[PDB]
Symmetry: D2
């Protein structure tokens, strides 16, 4: 999917996590976020169109999706324990990774 449509599924499943009532629903939504991030990993953002795929801005942009995937995985451990409320809080914290990359490249 294009970059805009991956961002949208990331933004929508964050909201779905806030309002969830059980672990299977948190699990479902985090899984969808992981696949969206993995698909986004290979795109070129508009603000970087004139750069080389080997350029440190592109390398840094890629790596931000690898950290996000790492944080979603750790949230997935807390849903499998039954510790649902912590899982929901770790999910909200993910905004930090979102904003840090938005500041440089959105």
């Amino acid at each position: 999917a294009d970059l805009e449509d991956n961002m949208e599924t990331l933004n929508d499943n964050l909201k779905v996590i806030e309002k969830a009532d059980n672990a299977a629903q948190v699990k479902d939504a985090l899984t969808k976020m992981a696949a969206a991030a993995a698909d986004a990993w290979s795109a070129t953002p508009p603000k970087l169109e004139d750069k080389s795929p080997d350029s440190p801005e592109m390398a840094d942009f890629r790596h931000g999706f690898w950290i996000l995937i790492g944080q979603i995985h750790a949230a997935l451990h807390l849903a499998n324990c039954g510790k649902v409320k912590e899982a929901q809080a770790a999910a909200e914290q993910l905004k930090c990774t979102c904003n840090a990359c938005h500041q440089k490249y959105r």
Copy 2:
């Protein structure tokens, strides 16, 4: 040291990282931050004085220092590679862990 004096050394070495010129100076300051966090790990904050050491607020408060120590360690890998500028950026990102705990417990 008391909680206030550990916070102060954490706050001061963040500023020292911004303005550093080489790897040995970033290394030095991150090391100091790690020891301050490890010393803070066992304190009771004012807003939690009436709670049991086994209580989920205390357990959650402790765990926030374990994540911070984990992030400082990863910043230390980037200073040892010579990749000084990335190390400085990972350091700024640490504010997220700072604020998230401040929101609940400062």
Copy 3:
């Protein structure tokens, strides 16, 4: 590719890493291992044919591939620093993750 062919590329590239002479060759071989491990992540092993895709043996089997990939990624940082020898040593340690999963499921 099938599970057998993925295991064979994993096994072959371990040997190529032992005998390498520069960082580009370590990098090339590690990259091929990551892609083999990502494809294998979605297979069903023979000894598990009679189980459900949601069953804790399957979920654990998947999870062994994620750890493998995380350790291959850290080895890739060591090759990009020019620290070739340390990279080679981190590659030999991967055997622990290979053997653990073979013990339960090969």
Copy 4:
């Protein structure tokens, strides 16, 4: 305590974990291993007596204790979920970190 006595508590508590019957006993033994590993973090091994405290053998030696501690911590999450058997299995995998460091420095 000295390095030898720390290794002996590490070795003893591995055996206690094998033979445990409930989560409180796994928890107790893992906790004693973490503290042994934290004390050992600042020792100098005999085979390294002639080296500088800033020397890459010493820095690598220290780093093996940090990884050990990180793997003991994750095992502690598994005991607190009530997933006792998985905890026991994660404890047996620690041998990989024990052996790797023995190969270079014992």
